[model samples]
Target: GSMSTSELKKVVALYDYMPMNANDLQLRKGDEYFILEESNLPWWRARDKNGQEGYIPSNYVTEAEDS
Candidate 1:
């Protein structure tokens, strides 16, 4: 599965979530970031302001902002 807009939004709203990779050091909630790609690992990876990457479960995300 791929990461959708709504799913991305939900992950951003969280306080702490799964890190996409080891480089994800200063991730924060409500950060205005976007997913560079999609995944079928049941989770979506996201990048932070500092280019930090992390993963959030697909089930916890949505394709719509209001989802």
Candidate 2:
């Protein structure tokens, strides 16, 4: 199930992350994404602006500062 904006953390990609695993998401820098969960270390559940969800290495992204 996809999460509503209220349920996710707003994040931004710090760089391009082409996920090689089936469970990971391909990320592009300077894009808006949603963080579904952060309980997992190093890896976290992520969702793109299009609502596509998958796993991403936490090192590739950072919490977006409110603008």
Candidate 3:
């Protein structure tokens, strides 16, 4: 589910890490996950899992099922 530019914002940096709501979350090196908050902003938004949310650059996540 690698999102297109029009579908998502650009990645701002590399090697940055975003925290998952749960204690143990894992992501691969070059994936594309979406910001699950209402705001389209790339800084801080909510994620659906773990009932936790924050701003994470799109670069840190992989597509929903492309890992």
Candidate 4:
């Protein structure tokens, strides 16, 4: 099963992504990924600009808020 963030969303590029993690995705330090599920802590199921979905360190990204 999968889900979407469904937030208005802000695009943050902390670097980049890679799709060869022994059957996994790797993120680069430029154009960032989207925080579709923060609750997935320690690792997030993220979607990148390249339309790739994968897991990343939760600590690597800070949860966001807006007024």
> Candidate 2: lDDT over CA atoms?
0.75
Backbone Cα, N, C clashes tallied per candidate:
7, 0, 10, 6
Q: What is the per-residue lDDT of model 2 for residues 9-59, given as tens digits with 9 covering 90 to 100? A: 667788888768667888888765778787749778888866678876777
Q: lDDT value for candidate 1? A: 0.49
Decide which is better by TM-score, 3 or 4. 4
Tens digits of lDDT, candidate 4, 1-67: 4444455342333445466653345676645666555563566676666776776665454433324
List the candidates ranked by lDDT, beginning with the highest: 2, 4, 1, 3
Q: Write the number of the candidate with greater TM-score, choosing between 1 and 4.
A: 4
Model 1 Cα lDDT, one tens digit per residue, 1-67:
5545554342343444545447443444554445655667755566556655666454444342443
Candidate 4 root-mean-square deviation in Å: 4.8
**Candidate no. 2 TM-score:** 0.71
TM-score of each: 0.42, 0.71, 0.35, 0.52
Q: Go through the candidates in order and give the C-alpha RMSD of each one to the true structure.
A: 5.7, 3.8, 7.8, 4.8
Model 1: per-residue Cα lDDT at residue 66 = 47
Per-residue CA lDDT of model 3 for 1-67, tens digit only, reads 5644445442222354645664323333544334443355434352434544455544454345522
Clashing pairs in 1: 6-62, 6-63, 7-61, 7-62, 19-54, 20-54, 20-55
lDDT (C-alpha) at residue 33 in model 2: 71
